[PDB]
Amino acid sequence: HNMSVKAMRFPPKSYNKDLESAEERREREQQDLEFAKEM
C-alpha cells in the first residue's frame, strides 16, 4: 500500500493554474454589488 502510493504520485503534473474566479467577471461581480448597495 505504500508502494502503491510511492509509485502513484508521478502523473501529478501539468496542474497548470488554479484560477480563483476571474479578472473581468470578478469586476462585474463588484459592479453588480455596487448597484445593489446604491439601490
Binding site: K17, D18, E20, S21, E23, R26, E27, Q30, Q31, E34
Partner: protein
C-alpha cells in the same frame, strides 16, 4: 593639495554638487503625466499620492514648477498632507546647502504662524533629508530647536531629521534629547524616538543601549512606541553574522508579536547579502509556523535583504510562496522579488509578477505594482519587452473609476519610481567592489513601512544613486572628451514622450554622460582625443582623465 586632500576625499563635497551638477543639466521629465493624474481630484489619498510621486521623480534637481503651478489643489488636503507637502520640498532640494534655509524661510515655524503646525513642524523632517550623511550646523540647528518646541508635531520632523543627519555617528549629544524623547510615556513620540535612536547607533551594538530599548518596549501600553523601537533594535546591529544570534532567539521566543517581527528584521540586517544556510533555516521556519500575519510578511521580505548578492536563486524559492493560502504571504512574496532583482531587468521575476496583479485581494495588487516598478527602472524596451507593456498598465488602472483606492495607490506611486530624476538616478544596494551600499540598505528597509506611517517611506532618496560616467583632469576643470559605443544602438533610448494637444553606434557623449550599467561594456575608449584615461574604465562615477 595634499593638505587639502583630506577635505577633497573625506568630506566628499565634490561628489555632492557634481551630482547636483549632473541633475541640473540632465533633466528629462514630463508635466503631462502629472496632468494625466490630475483628474483624480477628490478627498481621498490622491493628494498625498501625487505629492509623493513628483518628489520621487525630481530628487535633488531643485525644480519647483510641478508644485508651483497651483496653491489650492496643493493646499487642499490637510493635517498630515501638509506635513508631507513640506516634507517633499527637501527631497527636491537634496544635496544642496544653500537653498534649504532661504526657500523654507516662509516655512520657518516662527515667521507666519498659521493654523497648521504640521506645515511648519514638518520642515525639519525635510532638513534632515537634504543633509543626509552630512553633519554640520544641521546637527546643531536641529539640536537646539528640539530643546524648546511644541508637542510631538514638530518633534516628529525634528527627531526624524536629526537622527537622519547623524546616521551611524554614535553622537552622545543626539542621544541625550532622544532619551527624554523616549521616556515621555507617549504614543505620538513613539515613531519620533525609537527610529532615530537606532539610526545614530547603526552597527554599534552598544549593549546597554539595546538593553535600554528592549527593556523599555515590554511595559509600555502604546503601539507606535512598540513599533518605532521594533525597527531601531533591528538597526543597531548591522552585518555581524553571529553576534546577534543570542538576541534573535530571545526575540523569536517572546510572546509579543511585534517583537518577534522585530527579530525578523534584525536577522535580516545581521546577514546583509549573506548566503548563510544557518540563518535561512529558522528565518523561513517561522515563515511557516507563526500565527500573526504581520510577522509572516516580515519573514518573507527578509529574503531579498539577505540574498541580493545572487539574484538568480530568489525567483526559485519565492515563486512557490506566491501561491500561498493567505494574501499576507502572497503580498510579501512580491516585495521579496522587488528587493532582490531590482537592479536587474530580470526576465524570470517579471514572469512571476505577471499574474500577481490579478489577485482579488487589493493590497497584493498594490505591492505587485511597486515590485514591477523597481524591477525595470532606466530600462527601455530592449532589456525586456515588458516595459511598455506595463507603462500602459498603470494608466489602465488609474483612469478606472471602479477600482480600489489602494489598488490604484500602487499605480500613482509607480509613476514617480519608474521615471525617477528623468531616468538619471537608480537604486543600488551594491557597489562594484562587492561591498553593499548601507544607506540604500537602510533606505529600502525603511521604505517597506508605508503600512504603518505614510511619510515613513518618504525615506527613499538614500536608495537613489546616479549612473553617470564623469571625467576630470584638475581639481575643478571639466575636460572635453567625446567617446562612442560599439554594440547595438537602440539600447541608448530615451522615454520619448508623446505630447499630444542609417543609424548610430557612434554615440558621442560629454563629461556628465548618463549610461546604463549594462552599457558600460558596450562603449569605446577615447583613443583619438587629447585626453587618455589613466584608469581602466570599468565603473562610472568620477575618474581622473589624463591629458595627453
Amino acid at each position: 593639495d595634499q593638505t587639502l586632500k583630506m577635505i577633497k576625499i573625506l568630506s566628499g563635497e565634490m561628489a555632492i554638487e557634481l551630482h547636483l551638477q549632473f541633475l541640473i543639466r540632465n533633466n528629462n521629465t514630463d508635466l503631462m503625466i502629472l496632468k494625466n493624474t490630475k483628474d483624480a481630484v477628490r478627498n481621498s489619498v490622491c493628494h498625498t499620492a501625487t505629492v509623493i510621486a513628483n518628489s520621487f521623480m525630481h530628487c535633488g534637481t531643485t525644480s519647483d514648477q510641478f508644485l508651483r503651478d497651483n496653491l489650492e489643489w496643493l493646499a487642499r488636503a490637510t493635517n498630515w498632507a501638509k506635513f508631507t507637502a513640506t516634507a517633499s520640498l527637501g527631497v527636491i532640494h537634496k544635496g544642496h546647502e544653500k537653498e534649504a534655509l532661504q526657500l523654507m524661510a516662509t516655512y520657518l515655524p516662527k515667521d507666519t504662524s498659521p493654523g497648521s503646525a504640521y506645515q511648519e513642524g514638518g520642515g525639519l523632517y525635510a532638513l534632515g533629508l537634504i543633509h543626509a550623511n552630512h553633519g554640520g550646523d544641521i546637527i546643531d540647528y536641529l539640536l537646539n530647536q528640539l530643546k524648546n518646541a511644541s508637542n510631538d508635531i514638530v518633534r516628529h520632523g525634528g527627531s526624524l531629521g536629526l537622527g537622519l543627519a547623524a546616521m551611524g555617528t554614535a553622537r552622545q549629544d543626539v542621544y541625550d534629547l532622544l532619551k527624554t524623547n523616549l521616556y515621555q510615556d507617549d504614543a505620538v513620540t513613539g515613531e519620533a524616538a525609537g527610529l532615530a535612536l537606532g539610526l545614530v547607533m547603526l552597527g554599534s551594538k552598544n549593549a546597554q543601549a539595546i538593553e535600554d530599548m528592549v527593556g523599555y518596549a515590554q511595559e509600555t501600553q502604546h503601539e507606535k512606541i512598540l513599533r518605532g523601537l521594533a525597527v531601531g533594535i533591528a538597526l543597531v546591529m548591522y552585518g555581524r553574522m553571529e553576534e546577534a544570534d543570542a538576541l534573535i532567539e530571545s526575540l523569536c521566543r517572546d510572546k509579543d508579536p511585534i517583537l518577534r517581527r522585530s527579530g525578523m528584521y534584525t536577522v535580516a540586517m545581521a546577514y546583509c547579502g549573506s548566503g548563510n544556510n544557518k540563518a535561512i533555516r529558522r528565518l523561513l521556519h517561522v515563515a511557516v509556523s507563526d500565527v500573526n500575519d504581520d510577522v509572516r510578511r516580515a519573514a518573507v521580505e527578509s529574503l531579498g535583504f539577505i540574498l541580493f548578492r545572487t539574484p538568480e536563486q530568489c525567483p526559485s524559492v519565492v515563486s512557490l510562496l506566491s501561491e500561498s493560502y493567505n494574501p499576507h504571504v502572497r503580498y510579501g512574496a512580491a516585495m521579496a522579488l522587488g528587493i532582490c532583482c531590482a537592479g536587474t531587468g530580470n526576465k524570470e521575476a517579471i514572469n512571476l509578477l505577471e499574474p500577481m496583479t490579478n489577485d482579488p485581494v487589493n493590497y497584493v495588487r498594490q505591492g505587485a505594482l511597486i515590485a514591477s516598478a523597481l524591477i525595470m527602472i532606466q530600462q527601455t524596451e530592449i532589456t525586456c519587452p515588458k516595459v511598455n507593456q506595463f507603462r500602459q498598465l498603470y494608466s489602465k488602472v488609474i483612469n478606472d473609476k471602479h477600482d480600489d483606492v489602494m489598488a490604484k495607490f500602487g499605480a500613482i506611486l509607480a509613476q514617480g519610481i519608474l521615471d525617477a530624476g528623468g531616468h538619471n538616478v537608480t537604486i543600488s544596494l551594491q557597489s562594484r567592489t562587492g561591498h553593499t551600499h548601507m544607506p540604500s540598505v537602510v533606505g529600502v528597509l525603511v521604505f517597506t513601512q508605508f503600512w504603518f506611517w505614510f511619510p515613513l517611506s518618504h525615506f527613499l532618496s538614500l536608495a537613489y544613486t546616479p549612473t553617470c560616467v564623469i571625467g576630470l583632469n584638475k581639481d575643478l576643470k571639466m575636460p572635453k572628451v567625446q567617446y562612442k559605443s560599439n554594440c547595438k544602438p537602440s539600447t541608448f533610448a530615451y522615454p520619448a514622450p508623446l505630447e499630444v494637444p542609417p543609424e548610430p553606434n557612434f554615440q558621442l557623449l560629454d563629461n556628465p554622460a548618463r549610461v546604463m550599467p549594462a552599457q558600460l561594456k558596450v562603449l569605446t575608449m577615447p583613443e583619438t582625443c587629447r585626453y587618455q584615461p589613466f584608469k581602466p574604465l570599468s565603473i562610472g562615477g568620477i575618474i581622473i582623465l589624463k591629458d595627453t
